[PDB]
Amino acid sequence: QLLDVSRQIKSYWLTNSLSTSFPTVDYSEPDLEKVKRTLTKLQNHLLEVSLIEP
Amino acid sequence: FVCNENIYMAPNAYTLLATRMLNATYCFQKALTKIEKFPQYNPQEGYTYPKLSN
């Protein structure tokens, strides 16, 4: 029974919320520009773009 | 007393009573014998009941 209550108290110590979001994998930031090339060019595919013009 | 082709001393009540007490508590202890400690305790799993097949 003491093992029971002990496990209980374990749960009570551990049922507390995590202080924040916690680290995992944020490694290697994605390219901003290959994304833009996919977006634009694959959407610009087969188009007669005249650059930007004034 | 004439038990018919037998005659007997009259038993103490306490004798048979002790027989009852002893045999009963013996049934208790025997219930504790070849039965106990099969439900093995766990804080997590709780009591366990091993089998070749449950």
- The region that residue A46 occupies, defined by phi over 0 for left and psi between -120 and 50 for alpha, beta otherwise, is left
| Of A20, A43, A39, A21, residue with least CA distance to A31 | A39
Residue of B nearest to A1 (CA): B43
| Of B31, B49, B29, B30, residue with least CA distance to B39 | B49
Asked if residues B48 and B40 have their Cβ atoms less than 8 Å apart, the reply is yes
Contacts of A34 (CB under 8 A, 6+ apart): none
Cα–chain-centroid distance for residue A19?
19
- Distance, in Å, from the CA atom of B19 to the CA atom of B14, rounded to the nearest integer, reads 8
Question: Residues of A numbered 1-54 whose beta carbons fall under 8 angstroms of chain B's beta carbons: which are they?
Answer: 3-4, 6-7
Please tell me whether residue B48 adopts helix, strand or coil conformation.
Answer: strand
Asked if B44 lies within 8 A of A6 by C-beta distance, the reply is no
Q: How was this structure determined?
A: cryo-EM
